[PDB]
């Protein structure tokens, strides 16, 4: 309501309109190549910024700060894992997808194994994963930030946000989104940095976070409800391993072997096997631009710890009676949610710390984060649907009808997401961030397992890859459905789940499901006919000519040398930071 907020939001919209118009003036959007792969003309800095901005949504501010507040700094693991896995994308996966000439990752599996059915299955599974794990987290976190910061109707505002991101997605294509994602990356990091600075000032520096956070307990630990009573000291006191990334392998909330192996498997899917991230690399101009873009993305993926997780922890120190509430009736008064108020952590800092002008910048940050992620998911889902499913229904389609169908899918997936909003709003507190990582850990590892065996074991055939995926889905669902039946509850009100389902961490299940999908893929492969695949195997990883029988992934040796040394430097910095906070 202060003019300065409306001017900052208007200036942000003018930047987004302006970079969109410059991209539409520059690029061709009349062809499938142009609209869905940005002409394969994207240099390193939009690749990197777009990888970053398609990944960081409103969920990363709400979820990571909230989990920061609840549980300390090991959720940085979620972000920091990405660093190493984006080097797998640029050096292992992206070369193979460039030499295969794929528009989609289901098409790569069409090329590698050859049936009609793996491509259809992986398209449809991806489309469901985007609704369950990607749209849900964005819509949920948007609605938390609006409820808490603005106070507006959380239906009308999410309809309105979805409608502007629909227009923003359909009006340009992947080329406008990737250039606009350089501006969205700038706004996100810059506003997030200014709020991090105000937050760290309020607790009295970096030292202030680490000497006040283990003390940061609420004074309201006794419920008026009988059979809740005096709340346990485990449920309101901050965890004694709060300052440690690497937590106990059995009793850790995020066990270190689950963090390292289990997230590598799930991140593998997310970064290396999944249309949303990989479409930005498929739009790379060169392999060396994809590799440089991958390093930019890894450096930016270090930034979430300091911009989101540590502000969340500062939110627990400054507002311990509101952010670290445990009494079910106090948490209903604070944030509407009986199970906790950890999700207010980030929006509380914005409300309570930002002046008249910079509140508007923090609305622009959350808008930028939410629009970039939703636009990426809508465009990628459009590509997946158009190219995979609609060319099953209409093979002699042509590049004018396929763009119409691409833009109409964005309208349909917006409508599905509006109809999905009440179901996601039924997730109560910071449970949803666990649900989305649990879903990803139950559904993604079969897909990670097939892409690894698609790229590194040329004997894996179609029967193995398909029945690996389906067996994997069956094993996934055998956990998922039992779990979602029993609920989650909370530390105060435990769920009544057996400890032979929910007892094992979902990132440990991700490990088991990966090796079991993989073992079944190899077993069924070895017990069927070896399919010489044309004889071309530019669909596989090798050092020796990456091929067999434009599509030439040879880069300049000087620029090769540069990105190869910056990847090792970027890993060394990562491993230092893993060492530092372990």
């Amino acid at each position: 309501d202060n003019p300065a907020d409306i001017l900052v939001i208007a200036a942000y919209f003018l930047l987004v309109i302006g970079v969109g118009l410059w991209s539409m003036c520059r690029t061709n959007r009349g062809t499938v190549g142009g609209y869905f792969l940005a002409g394969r003309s994207m240099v390193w800095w939009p690749v990197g910024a777009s990888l970053f901005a398609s990944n960081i949504g409103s969920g990363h501010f709400v979820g990571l700060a909230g989990t920061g507040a609840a549980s300390g700094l090991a959720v940085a693991g979620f972000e920091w894992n990405a660093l190493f896995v984006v080097l797998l994308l640029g050096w292992l996966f992206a070369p193979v997808y460039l030499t295969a000439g794929v528009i989609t990752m289901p098409q790569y599996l069409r090329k590698r194994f050859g049936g009609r059915r793996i491509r259809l299955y992986l398209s449809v599974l991806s489309l469901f994963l985007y609704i369950f794990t990607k749209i849900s987290v964005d819509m949920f976190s948007g609605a938390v930030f609006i409820q808490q910061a603005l106070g507006w109707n959380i239906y009308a505002s999410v309809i309105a946000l979805l409608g502007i991101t629909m227009i923003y997605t359909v009006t340009g294509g992947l080329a406008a989104l990737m250039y606009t994602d350089t501006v969205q990356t700038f706004v996100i990091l810059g506003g997030a940095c200014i709020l991090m600075g105000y937050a760290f000032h309020e607790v009295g520096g970096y030292s202030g976070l680490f000497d006040k956070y283990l003390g940061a307990a609420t004074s309201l630990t006794v419920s008026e409800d009988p059979a809740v009573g005096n709340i346990s000291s485990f449920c309101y006191r901050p965890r004694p391993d709060s300052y440690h990334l690497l937590r106990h392998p059995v009793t850790g909330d995020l066990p270190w072997p689950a963090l390292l192996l289990g997230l590598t498997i799930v991140s593998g899917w997310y970064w290396c096997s999944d249309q949303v991230i990989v479409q930005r690399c498929l739009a790379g101009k060169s392999l060396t631009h994809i590799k440089a873009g991958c390093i930019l993305c890894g450096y930016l993926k270090l930034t979430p710890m300091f911009l989101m997780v540590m502000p969340g922890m500062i939110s627990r120190i400054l507002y311990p009676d509101e952010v670290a509430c445990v009494v079910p009736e106090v948490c209903r008064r604070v944030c509407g949610t009986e199970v906790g108020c950890s999700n207010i952590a980030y929006p509380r800092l914005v409300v309570k710390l930002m002046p008249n002008g910079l509140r508007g910048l923090m609305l622009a940050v959350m808008l930028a984060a939410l629009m970039s992620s939703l636009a990426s998911i809508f465009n990628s889902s459009s590509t997946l649907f158009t190219m995979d499913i609609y060319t099953r229904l209409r093979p002699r389609a042509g590049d004018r009808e396929l763009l119409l169908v691409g833009r109409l899918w964005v309208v349909f997936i917006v409508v599905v997401s509006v109809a999905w909003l009440p179901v996601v709003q039924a997730a109560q507190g910071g449970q949803l961030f666990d649900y989305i990582q649990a879903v990803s850990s139950y559904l993604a590892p079969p897909v990670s397992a097939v892409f690894v065996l698609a790229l590194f074991v040329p004997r894996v055939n179609e029967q193995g890859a398909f029945w690996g995926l389906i067996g994997g889905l069956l094993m996934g669902l055998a956990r998922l459905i039992p779990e979602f039946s029993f609920g989650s509850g909370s530390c105060v009100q435990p769920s009544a789940c057996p400890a032979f389902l929910c007892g094992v961490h979902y990132l440990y299940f991700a490990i088991v499901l990966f090796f079991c999908s993989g073992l079944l893929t190899l077993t069924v492969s070895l017990c069927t006919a070896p399919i010489p695949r044309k004889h071309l195997h530019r669909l596989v990883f090798s050092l020796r000519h990456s091929k067999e029988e434009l599509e030439d992934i040879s880069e300049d040796p000087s620029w090769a040398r540069v990105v190869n040394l910056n990847a090792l430097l970027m890993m060394a910095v990562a491993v230092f930071l893993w060492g530092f906070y372990a």
Partner: peptide
């Protein structure tokens, strides 16, 4: 001390990258 945990992690990583260059130099050529 955090700084020393960081350095020991980096040290071990530079040993593993030296091992990677050793194994591919003698076993791919």
């Amino acid at each position: 001390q955090p700084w020393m945990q960081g350095l020991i992690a980096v040290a071990v990583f530079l040993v593993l990258v030296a091992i990677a260059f050793a194994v591919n130099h003698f076993w791919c050529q």
